[PDB]
Amino acid sequence: ARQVTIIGAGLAGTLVARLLARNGWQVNLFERRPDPRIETGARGRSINLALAERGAHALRLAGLEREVLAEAVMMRGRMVHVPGTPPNLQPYGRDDSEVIWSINRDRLNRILLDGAEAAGASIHFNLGLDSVDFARQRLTLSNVSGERLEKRFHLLIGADGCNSAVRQAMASVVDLGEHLETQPHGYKELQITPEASAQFNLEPNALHIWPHGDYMCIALPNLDRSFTVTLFLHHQSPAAQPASPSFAQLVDGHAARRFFQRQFPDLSPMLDSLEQDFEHHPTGKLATLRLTTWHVGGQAVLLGDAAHPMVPFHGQGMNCALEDAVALAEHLQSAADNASALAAFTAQRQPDALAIQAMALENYVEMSSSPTYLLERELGQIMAQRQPTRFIPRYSMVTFSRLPYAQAMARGQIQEQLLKFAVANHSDLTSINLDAVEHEVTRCLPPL
Numbered sequence: 001a002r003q004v005t006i007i008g009a010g011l012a013g014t015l016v017a018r019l020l021a022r023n024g025w026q027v028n029l030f031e032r033r034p035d036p037r038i039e040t041g042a043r044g045r046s047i048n049l050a051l052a053e054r055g056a057h058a059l060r061l062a063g064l065e066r067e068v069l070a071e072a073v074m075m076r077g078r079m080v081h082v083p084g085t086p087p088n089l090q091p092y093g094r095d096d097s098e099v100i101w102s103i104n105r106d107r108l109n110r111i112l113l114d115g116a117e118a119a120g121a122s123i124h125f126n127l128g129l130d131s132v133d134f135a136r137q138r139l140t141l142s143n144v145s146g147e148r149l150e151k152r153f154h155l156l157i158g159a160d161g162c163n164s165a166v167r168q169a170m171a172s173v174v175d176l177g178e179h180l181e182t183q184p185h186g187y188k189e190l191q192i193t194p195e196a197s198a199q200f201n202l203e204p205n206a207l208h209i210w211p212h213g214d215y216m217c218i219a220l221p222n223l224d225r226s227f228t229v230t231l232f233l234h235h236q237s238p239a240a241q242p243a244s245p246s247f248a249q250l251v252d253g254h255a256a257r258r259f260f261q262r263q264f265p266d267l268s269p270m271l272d273s274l275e276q277d278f279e280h281h282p283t284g285k286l287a288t289l290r291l292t293t294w295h296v297g298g299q300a301v302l303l304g305d306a307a308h309p310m311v312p313f314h315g316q317g318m319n320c321a322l323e324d325a326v327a328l329a330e331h332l333q334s335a336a337d338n339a340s341a342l343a344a345f346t347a348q349r350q351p352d353a354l355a356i357q358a359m360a361l362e363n364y365v366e367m368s369s370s371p372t373y374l375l376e377r378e379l380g381q382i383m384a385q386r387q388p389t390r391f392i393p394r395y396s397m398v399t400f401s402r403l404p405y406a407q408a409m410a411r412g413q414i415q416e417q418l419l420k421f422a423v424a425n426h427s428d429l430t431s432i433n434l435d436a437v438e439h440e441v442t443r444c445l446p447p448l
């Protein structure tokens, strides 16, 4: 039996552990955190994620989708909140087949952990990877107390997140050609209780957005009608706009309250613990990190956030990480050797990870920001109606299809250009020749 050591019992790590273990691999998974399945008296906060077709299909292949979806809230559309007007619901797709799912992170990780162990993987918690000796094929782990433990490894999988220790170790033996692109927005998690969401009639079966240009809030629902709210706001005010809102200007919870009362007036009343949440939850950082290579020969490979940290604005980090786990397990299972598997996995996945990193950066303006855009969208709907197998909105290709991200982006670019061009020098839909635009759709977009 082939042997593998996985670092990080997160989403990609636990999924790949299950897929490999059920194929008879000897799997050892090391996780720095404690086992979340060991119930304690601690009050841990609820992070929600938007699971879409790529992640759901990865779970489906692993036989875990039904279990995960049983604990997920259906989000049928995007509810845009602009003060003064009732919330506007933009359905995400054609029917209830085209939805996204709000899942609690902890519930998903419990299901994945159980799944990896049921398949035969051994999971070792409270052990963080500190260093790797590639030459000797040994690694060093430590607990929170700092006691070190050395292990031999045959194949190392870095599923250890955005700040991957495996990536750091690899960067000492190979040039990973890393390029870090900082992101000016920090984030803060806030909570809406079930009583508050019910009192203010906040729709449970939707993803909620409070656009505000350079900053915004999003809220995802929980099974108990509570919502996790994420505030995205610049860490610092830029030199050109020193008065522009930023986390630096929000000195405490009281300042956060005044900011929400002025900028998000219909949201502030739903945030009962705003002051406490603001002061006790730390401000998180966002980034895009791109690598030229994801592996060291046949010895080690990265996947998920360890390979390609991305900005959160497309809700695709988990979806991409789970899609990577399937691809990795498939390549490892069938290749001539690990070196061939890792090179083929990297060659397949890197262009797609680059595409979603670019599309996620682009999606910020689509959420938080129009006269020319409405005519483009109006023309886009007719083209999608006339040609639904050809003209598929980019959000739908990324969210509801398994088309390689690079292809979703390429078709998205053709569509965006087509619309931008077609509307240029036209006041309305009457002056636009619909059959001419449709001919360009048939000429440039093959049916899928």
Ligand SMILES: Cc1cc2nc3c(=O)[nH]c(=O)nc-3n(C[C@H](O)[C@H](O)[C@H](O)COP(=O)(O)OP(=O)(O)OC[C@H]3O[C@@H](n4cnc5c(N)ncnc54)[C@H](O)[C@@H]3O)c2cc1C
Pocket: 007, 008, 009, 010, 011, 012, 013, 030, 031, 032, 033, 047, 048, 049, 050, 051, 127, 128, 129, 130, 159, 160, 161, 162, 163, 164, 165, 166, 303, 304, 305, 306, 312, 314, 315, 316, 317, 318, 319, 320, 321
């Ligand atoms: C609050 C929040 C909300 C998000 N919402 C969405 C969403 O709506 N949709 C979406 O698709 N994505 C979302 N994402 C992104 C998504 O969570 C990640 O892209 C995804 O978890 C990446 O999976 P992963 O397995 O690569 O890493 P992770 O799931 O982060 O797992 C990494 C694991 O490695 C462990 N680890 C780290 N360092 C070490 C070490 N040295 N030794 C041992 N173990 C280690 C960690 O403790 C963790 O268990 C969100 C992210 C956050 C933080």
Ligand SMILES: Cc1ccc([C@@H](C)Oc2cc3onc(CCC(=O)O)c3cc2Cl)nn1
Pocket: 048, 049, 050, 078, 187, 207, 218, 220, 230, 284, 312, 313, 314, 315, 316, 363, 366, 367
């Ligand atoms: C660090 C951290 C915080 C919180 C998040 C998640 C909750 O943020 C998002 C999830 C999401 O799912 N789908 C979308 C796009 C929805 C749309 O265009 O209508 C989306 C956007 C964001 Cl910011 N991710 N990481």
